[PDB]
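User: Sequence recovery, please. Input:
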């Protein structure tokens, strides 16, 4: 049911935080489109924090979902889950131990986020946009969306804010 919140968006993915709140990666948003989920973009309030992109819709799109907690990353050392959906449909939950929160230089662009290390295949280019989630007590907490990963190593970057 939490997987039903990850949706094909552009060249990547997006996650329904609330009935009205879609989050995704800036690199993934289609730039030639004038409506998202049937709502015209003129009526959609889009806020960008580097690679973390937040789309607030005028009217709730997903009646069925409950709102989730959104926070700027997780505490250093938290083992989050990277809910990767694949274009084939397969679901790849990945464990990532999150680390330093920082503003990073990724390919000349400035990016706020949190680095993480995948624990024990890996991530690929279709995967930008998928959410990082960890359970805190009884509530799930979404902390960011996948934006990058080191060519050499396990490092994954989770765009935040
Ligand atoms: C997802 C988006 C995509 O395909 O867009 C094309 C622009 C893709 C996912 C990664 C590719 C391989 N595995 C992935 O998880 N993201 C990107 O291609 C971003 C670039 C990278 O991932 C590079 N990584 C780094 O530069 C890097 C830096 C650090 C600390 O760790 N890795 C490649 C080595 C893959 C696109 C991007 C995002 C944000 C930016 F500011 C610039 C560029």
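Assistant: Recovered sequence (161 residues):
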């Amino acid at each position: 049911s939490i997987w039903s919140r990850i949706v094909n968006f552009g060249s990547g993915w997006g996650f329904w935080v609330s009935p009205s709140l879609f989050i995704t990666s800036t690199h993934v948003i289609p730039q030639g489109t004038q409506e998202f989920f049937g709502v015209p973009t003129k009526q959609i309030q889009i806020h960008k924090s580097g690679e973390f992109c937040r789309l607030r819709f005028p009217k709730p799109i997903r009646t069925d979902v409950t709102g989730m907690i959104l926070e700027e990353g997780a505490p250093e050392g938290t083992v989050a889950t990277l809910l990767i959906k694949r274009p084939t449909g397969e679901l790849m939950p990945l464990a990532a131990r999150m680390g330093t929160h920082a503003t990073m230089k990724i390919q000349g662009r400035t990016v706020g986020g949190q680095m993480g290390m995948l624990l024990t295949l890996g991530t690929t280019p279709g995967d930008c946009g998928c959410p990082y989630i960890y359970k805190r007590g009884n509530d799930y907490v979404v902390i960011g969306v996948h934006t990058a990963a080191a060519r050499g190593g396990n490092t994954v970057i989770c765009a935040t804010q």
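Residues 3-56 form a domain with the Thrombin, subunit H fold (CATH 2.40.10.10).
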